[PDB]
Design an enzyme around this catalytic site. Structure first.
Site, PDB file in Angstrom:
ATOM      1  N   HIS A  44     -46.767  12.267  -6.271  1.00 48.05           N
ATOM      2  CA  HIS A  44     -46.390  11.515  -7.445  1.00 48.05           C
ATOM      3  C   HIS A  44     -45.684  12.394  -8.469  1.00 48.05           C
ATOM      4  O   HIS A  44     -45.293  11.941  -9.548  1.00 48.05           O
ATOM      5  CB  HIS A  44     -47.626  10.926  -8.074  1.00 48.05           C
ATOM      6  CG  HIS A  44     -48.383  11.885  -8.933  1.00 48.05           C
ATOM      7  ND1 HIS A  44     -49.476  12.576  -8.490  1.00 48.05           N
ATOM      8  CD2 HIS A  44     -48.143  12.309 -10.181  1.00 48.05           C
ATOM      9  CE1 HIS A  44     -49.902  13.426  -9.427  1.00 48.05           C
ATOM     10  NE2 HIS A  44     -49.107  13.273 -10.447  1.00 48.05           N
ATOM     11  N   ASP A  93     -51.663  11.207  -1.913  1.00 48.54           N
ATOM     12  CA  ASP A  93     -50.904  11.899  -2.947  1.00 48.54           C
ATOM     13  C   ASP A  93     -50.793  13.368  -2.569  1.00 48.54           C
ATOM     14  O   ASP A  93     -51.499  14.223  -3.096  1.00 48.54           O
ATOM     15  CB  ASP A  93     -51.605  11.752  -4.305  1.00 48.54           C
ATOM     16  CG  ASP A  93     -50.732  12.209  -5.468  1.00 48.54           C
ATOM     17  OD1 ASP A  93     -49.530  12.461  -5.242  1.00 48.54           O
ATOM     18  OD2 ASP A  93     -51.248  12.308  -6.608  1.00 48.54           O
ATOM     19  N   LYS A 160     -68.556   4.433  -8.262  1.00 48.16           N
ATOM     20  CA  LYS A 160     -69.246   3.733  -9.338  1.00 48.16           C
ATOM     21  C   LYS A 160     -68.478   3.834 -10.650  1.00 48.16           C
ATOM     22  O   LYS A 160     -68.543   2.927 -11.473  1.00 48.16           O
ATOM     23  CB  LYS A 160     -70.646   4.313  -9.564  1.00 48.16           C
ATOM     24  CG  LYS A 160     -71.708   3.923  -8.545  1.00 48.16           C
ATOM     25  CD  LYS A 160     -73.058   4.476  -8.986  1.00 48.16           C
ATOM     26  CE  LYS A 160     -74.167   4.117  -8.016  1.00 48.16           C
ATOM     27  NZ  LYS A 160     -75.481   4.644  -8.488  1.00 48.16           N
ATOM     28  N   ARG A 161     -67.765   4.942 -10.844  1.00 41.57           N
ATOM     29  CA  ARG A 161     -67.013   5.167 -12.077  1.00 41.57           C
ATOM     30  C   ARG A 161     -65.625   4.529 -12.073  1.00 41.57           C
ATOM     31  O   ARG A 161     -64.977   4.432 -13.114  1.00 41.57           O
ATOM     32  CB  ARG A 161     -66.878   6.671 -12.339  1.00 41.57           C
ATOM     33  CG  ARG A 161     -68.187   7.450 -12.240  1.00 41.57           C
ATOM     34  CD  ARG A 161     -69.261   6.846 -13.123  1.00 41.57           C
ATOM     35  NE  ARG A 161     -70.524   7.575 -13.033  1.00 41.57           N
ATOM     36  CZ  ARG A 161     -71.695   7.086 -13.430  1.00 41.57           C
ATOM     37  NH1 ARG A 161     -71.765   5.863 -13.941  1.00 41.57           N
ATOM     38  NH2 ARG A 161     -72.796   7.819 -13.321  1.00 41.57           N
ATOM     39  N   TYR A 162     -65.161   4.100 -10.906  1.00 43.43           N
ATOM     40  CA  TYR A 162     -63.850   3.473 -10.810  1.00 43.43           C
ATOM     41  C   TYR A 162     -63.943   2.174 -10.015  1.00 43.43           C
ATOM     42  O   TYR A 162     -63.293   2.017  -8.977  1.00 43.43           O
ATOM     43  CB  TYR A 162     -62.848   4.427 -10.143  1.00 43.43           C
ATOM     44  CG  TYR A 162     -62.462   5.614 -10.999  1.00 43.43           C
ATOM     45  CD1 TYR A 162     -63.087   6.851 -10.847  1.00 43.43           C
ATOM     46  CD2 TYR A 162     -61.487   5.491 -11.975  1.00 43.43           C
ATOM     47  CE1 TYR A 162     -62.742   7.931 -11.655  1.00 43.43           C
ATOM     48  CE2 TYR A 162     -61.137   6.561 -12.785  1.00 43.43           C
ATOM     49  CZ  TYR A 162     -61.765   7.773 -12.625  1.00 43.43           C
ATOM     50  OH  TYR A 162     -61.429   8.816 -13.453  1.00 43.43           O
ATOM     51  N   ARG A 163     -64.749   1.241 -10.514  1.00 42.55           N
ATOM     52  CA  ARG A 163     -64.944  -0.036  -9.837  1.00 42.55           C
ATOM     53  C   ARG A 163     -63.668  -0.839  -9.626  1.00 42.55           C
ATOM     54  O   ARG A 163     -63.657  -1.800  -8.862  1.00 42.55           O
ATOM     55  CB  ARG A 163     -65.984  -0.878 -10.585  1.00 42.55           C
ATOM     56  CG  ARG A 163     -67.398  -0.300 -10.499  1.00 42.55           C
ATOM     57  CD  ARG A 163     -68.440  -1.279 -11.017  1.00 42.55           C
ATOM     58  NE  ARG A 163     -69.805  -0.796 -10.818  1.00 42.55           N
ATOM     59  CZ  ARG A 163     -70.896  -1.505 -11.100  1.00 42.55           C
ATOM     60  NH1 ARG A 163     -70.784  -2.732 -11.596  1.00 42.55           N
ATOM     61  NH2 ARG A 163     -72.100  -0.988 -10.892  1.00 42.55           N
ATOM     62  N   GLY A 186     -49.831  17.135 -16.565  1.00 43.79           N
ATOM     63  CA  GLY A 186     -49.173  18.422 -16.439  1.00 43.79           C
ATOM     64  C   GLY A 186     -49.878  19.301 -15.415  1.00 43.79           C
ATOM     65  O   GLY A 186     -49.276  20.228 -14.862  1.00 43.79           O
ATOM     66  N   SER A 188     -51.168  18.028 -12.686  1.00 39.62           N
ATOM     67  CA  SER A 188     -50.874  17.335 -11.434  1.00 39.62           C
ATOM     68  C   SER A 188     -50.267  18.255 -10.387  1.00 39.62           C
ATOM     69  O   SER A 188     -49.388  19.058 -10.688  1.00 39.62           O
ATOM     70  CB  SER A 188     -49.906  16.177 -11.705  1.00 39.62           C
ATOM     71  OG  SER A 188     -50.605  15.033 -12.168  1.00 39.62           O
ATOM     72  N   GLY A 189     -50.730  18.124  -9.149  1.00 35.73           N
ATOM     73  CA  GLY A 189     -50.210  18.961  -8.084  1.00 35.73           C
ATOM     74  C   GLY A 189     -50.969  20.267  -8.061  1.00 35.73           C
ATOM     75  O   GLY A 189     -50.879  21.019  -7.094  1.00 35.73           O
TER      76      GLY A 189
HETATM   77  C1  LIG Z   1     -50.551  14.936 -13.612  1.00 32.78           C
HETATM   78  O1  LIG Z   1     -50.787  16.215 -14.205  1.00 32.78           O
HETATM   79  C2  LIG Z   1     -51.694  13.966 -14.014  1.00 32.78           C
HETATM   80  C3  LIG Z   1     -53.082  14.587 -13.864  1.00 32.78           C
HETATM   81  C4  LIG Z   1     -54.179  13.603 -14.249  1.00 32.78           C
HETATM   82  C5  LIG Z   1     -55.550  14.198 -14.074  1.00 32.78           C
HETATM   83  N1  LIG Z   1     -56.543  13.360 -14.706  1.00 32.78           N
HETATM   84  C6  LIG Z   1     -57.894  13.729 -14.837  1.00 32.78           C
HETATM   85  N2  LIG Z   1     -58.438  14.641 -14.113  1.00 32.78           N
HETATM   86  N3  LIG Z   1     -58.672  13.065 -15.799  1.00 32.78           N
HETATM   87  N4  LIG Z   1     -51.707  12.827 -13.101  1.00 32.78           N
HETATM   88  C7  LIG Z   1     -51.250  11.623 -13.400  1.00 32.78           C
HETATM   89  O2  LIG Z   1     -50.751  11.348 -14.506  1.00 32.78           O
HETATM   90  C8  LIG Z   1     -51.385  10.556 -12.310  1.00 32.78           C
HETATM   91  N5  LIG Z   1     -51.513   9.264 -12.985  1.00 32.78           N
HETATM   92  C9  LIG Z   1     -52.664   8.952 -13.686  1.00 32.78           C
HETATM   93  O3  LIG Z   1     -53.625   9.743 -13.767  1.00 32.78           O
HETATM   94  C10 LIG Z   1     -52.815   7.731 -14.359  1.00 32.78           C
HETATM   95  N6  LIG Z   1     -54.010   7.446 -15.083  1.00 32.78           N
HETATM   96  C11 LIG Z   1     -54.234   6.110 -15.566  1.00 32.78           C
HETATM   97  C12 LIG Z   1     -55.376   5.413 -14.906  1.00 32.78           C
HETATM   98  C13 LIG Z   1     -55.765   5.685 -13.566  1.00 32.78           C
HETATM   99  C14 LIG Z   1     -56.867   4.999 -12.988  1.00 32.78           C
HETATM  100  C15 LIG Z   1     -57.586   4.042 -13.734  1.00 32.78           C
HETATM  101  C16 LIG Z   1     -57.195   3.770 -15.055  1.00 32.78           C
HETATM  102  C17 LIG Z   1     -56.092   4.457 -15.635  1.00 32.78           C
HETATM  103  C18 LIG Z   1     -51.713   6.841 -14.260  1.00 32.78           C
HETATM  104  N7  LIG Z   1     -50.585   7.119 -13.580  1.00 32.78           N
HETATM  105  C19 LIG Z   1     -50.506   8.320 -12.957  1.00 32.78           C
HETATM  106  S1  LIG Z   1     -49.007   8.585 -12.099  1.00 32.78           S
HETATM  107  C20 LIG Z   1     -48.024   9.862 -12.934  1.00 32.78           C
HETATM  108  C21 LIG Z   1     -49.174  14.451 -14.069  1.00 32.78           C
HETATM  109  N8  LIG Z   1     -48.362  13.924 -13.234  1.00 32.78           N
HETATM  110  C22 LIG Z   1     -47.155  13.565 -13.903  1.00 32.78           C
HETATM  111  C23 LIG Z   1     -47.187  13.878 -15.255  1.00 32.78           C
HETATM  112  S2  LIG Z   1     -48.660  14.594 -15.691  1.00 32.78           S
END
Ligand SMILES: *[C@](=O)([C]([C][C][C][N]C([N])=[N])[N]C(=O)[C]N1C(=O)C([N][C]C2=[C][C]=[C][C]=[C]2)=[C]N=C1S[C])C1=N[C]=[C]S1
Length: 237
Positions: A44, A93, A160-163, A186, A188-189
């Protein structure tokens, strides 16, 4: 990273910072050196990316400030995204970046070993998530690579935390029930390193989560051991 601290230089030699030159250069995502010509990261992280030509991989970096116009980097020859990937929250992912040139290992940049299928039973008790990601929502890319020790949570507890989602066996979660420490935008990856028996293993890849470091909202990561066969297939010339 939230609730983390400054990393020691060379402490996470497999950690790389992935940069994008469009429009202007900036940190895009984290990644992990797993082979002399291979970076393992999140899929992603390539949204909107139509060409590997705008990518730059920097290894042996502690502070983003070390990266300048002259600073050397690794070009990306090919971006390999899992064919089943659709979106982070659905799984798969994971992506591989084939570098244009080979990485010369040293104390500052070396590969991290992949988990062994026979390690799927191992009990990781020393796991850390690292990155230059947000230290909080609506924040910004950090200069110094941050680190945070975070306990793994069972898939049952995570579900349980992500129903509203399906936490599959191809995902692994980590976090404190009370929150406070977690990966963020940031990161991510990035790698979710876990030291077992004196050896570091790439247990997960920072993928997603609801917000960052919220109570009862563990960070979700790609369960790397579930992709060892895929990684082998995609990297074997
Ligand atoms: C990544 O750095 C982030 C890392 C997120 C890590 N989150 C933790 N550990 N709390 N990844 C993303 O942004 C991937 N992503 C999402 O996390 C969300 N969150 C919304 C959400 C998800 C589930 C249930 C409710 C809400 C939404 N979209 C995405 S896709 C980008 C980065 N990747 C790109 C920029 S920063």
């Amino acid at each position: 990273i939230v609730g983390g601290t400054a990393s020691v230089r060379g402490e996470w030699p497999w950690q790389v910072t992935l940069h994008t030159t469009s429009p202007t250069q900036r940190h895009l995502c984290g990644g992990s050196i797993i082979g002399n010509q291979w970076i393992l990261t999140a899929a992603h992280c390539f949204y909107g990316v139509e060409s590997p030509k705008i990518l730059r991989v920097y290894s042996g970096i502690l502070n983003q400030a070390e990266i300048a116009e002259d600073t050397s980097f690794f070009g990306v020859q090919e971006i390999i995204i899992h064919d089943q990937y659709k979106m982070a929250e659905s799984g798969y992912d994971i992506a591989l970046l084939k570098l244009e040139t080979t990485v010369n290992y040293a104390d500052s940049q070396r590969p991290i070993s992949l988990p062994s299928k026979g390690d799927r039973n191992v009990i990781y008790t020393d796991c850390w998530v690292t990155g230059w990601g947000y230290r909080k929502l609506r924040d910004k890319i950090q200069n110094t690579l941050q680190k945070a020790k975070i306990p793994l949570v069972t898939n049952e507890e995570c579900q349980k935390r992500y129903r509203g989602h399906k936490i599959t066996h191809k995902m692994i979660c980590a976090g404190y029930r009370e929150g406070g420490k977690d990966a963020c935008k940031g990161d991510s990856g990035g790698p979710l390193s876990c030291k077992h028996n004196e050896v570091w293993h790439l247990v997960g890849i920072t993928s997603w989560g609801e917000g960052c470091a919220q109570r009862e909202r563990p960070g979700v990561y790609t369960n790397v051991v579930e992709y060892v066969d895929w990684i082998l297939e995609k990297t074997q010339a």
